[PDB]
Design a protein around this ligand. Structure first.
Ligand SMILES: O=C(O)CNC(=O)C(=O)O
Ligand SMILES: [Mg+2]
Ligand code: NI
Ligand SMILES: [Zn+2]
Length: 331
């Protein structure tokens, strides 16, 4: 068995190997990459996403989200308070202000220490989940707006034609902006490209050990657990590495820098934070190996998780017993 300790693997494809996206994902899995739940892909030196980032300031962040924490430093939830619209140039200036900027630090480890010590005492503003793309239309390799669609994968594997579409999302971050512990919708893959700015630190639990994280979360967030049998689908709970280590939960960590891709694998729980002003692009995708994960994915039916139009068909075809209850949650 390849990668039996479930370490995060880092790949350096050549420009020739960067042509065929599906083939390279399958190669990474042949080497055991999926066992970690997360892999890093450094693009060949010849490749670029676009020519420059000099002209992005007029993108609108229609609903910036202020991430307000409750709890203790290592075990907290966050809620998202909606703020007035602002442009990416306005948001960058805000991120760089004395109230929100990255503090002085020695290295990524010192910054990570400061994040876990102090996150709860601040409320950073995240421009998340913005439909759109920063890849140039002429970028032919690993262009997250030109991937094969999940609807087409389902149709190719299972024969059933379904409605829905699959487009990327932009994320504009600042110091301390936070992504809570989660797997993807329908335990899909994700791919995330850090277009510009400061790093993103990731934490991940191997898919084979995901239920250990879930049992800890039920113990740490006991009211939330009574409310919903899949409350991590709400994407609000944080647990620090120190707390994970104290409770014996297997995990790994890695920091993504500008110009690098990350792939999350089916049922790989992940969480993390931004180091300072940045912009990332991410999208879900599927392979043949995902179908069995999609059939087994948990679902929130309490009403909190509320998701895209396209998840309807995935539930209806892969999980017809759950369909009725899940759709009640959506309506
Ligand atoms: O970058 C973020 O805020 C969150 N991204 C992801 O969870 C992802 O790419 O799967
Ligand atoms: Mg612009
Ligand atoms: Ni994710
Ligand atoms: Zn729920």
């Amino acid at each position: 068995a390849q990668n039996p300790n479930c370490n995060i693997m880092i790949f350096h494809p050549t420009k020739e190997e960067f042509n065929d996206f599906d083939k390279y994902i399958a190669y990474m899995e042949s080497q055991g990459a999926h066992r970690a739940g997360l892999a890093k892909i450094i693009p060949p030196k010849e490749w670029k996403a676009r020519e420059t980032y000099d002209n992005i300031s007029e993108i609108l962040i229609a609903t910036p989200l202020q991430q307000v924490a409750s709890g203790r430093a290592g075990v907290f939830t966050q809620y998202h308070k909606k703020k007035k619209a602002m442009t990416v140039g306005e948001y960058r200036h805000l991120a760089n202000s004395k109230k929100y900027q990255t503090p002085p630090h020695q290295n990524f480890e010192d910054l990570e220490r400061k994040y876990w010590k102090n996150r709860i005492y601040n409320s950073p503003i995240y421009g998340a989940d913005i439909s759109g793309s920063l890849f140039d239309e002429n970028t032919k390799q690993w262009n997250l707006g030109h991937l094969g669609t999940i609807q087409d994968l389902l149709e190719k594997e299972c024969g059933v034609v379904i409605e829905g579409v699959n487009t990327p999302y932009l994320y504009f971050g600042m110091w301390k902006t936070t992504f809570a512990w989660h797997t993807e919708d329908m335990d899909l893959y994700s791919i995330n490209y850090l277009h510009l700015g400061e790093p993103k630190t990731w934490y991940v639990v191997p898919p084979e050990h995901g239920q250990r994280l879930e049992r800890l979360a039920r113990e740490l967030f006991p009211g939330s657990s009574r409310g919903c049998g899949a409350f991590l689908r709400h994407k609000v709970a944080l647990i620090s590495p120190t707390v994970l280590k104290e409770n014996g939960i297997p995990f790994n960590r890695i920091t993504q820098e500008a110009g690098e891709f990350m792939v999350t694998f089916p049922y790989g729980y992940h969480a993390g934070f931004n180091h300072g002003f940045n912009c990332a692009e991410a999208i879900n995708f599927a392979t043949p190996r995902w179908i069995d994960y999609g059939k087994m994915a948990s679902q929130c039916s309490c009403g909190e998780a509320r998701v895209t139009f396209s998840m309807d068909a995935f539930v209806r075809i892969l999980q017809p017993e759950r369909y009725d209850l899940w759709k009640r949650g959506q309506d």
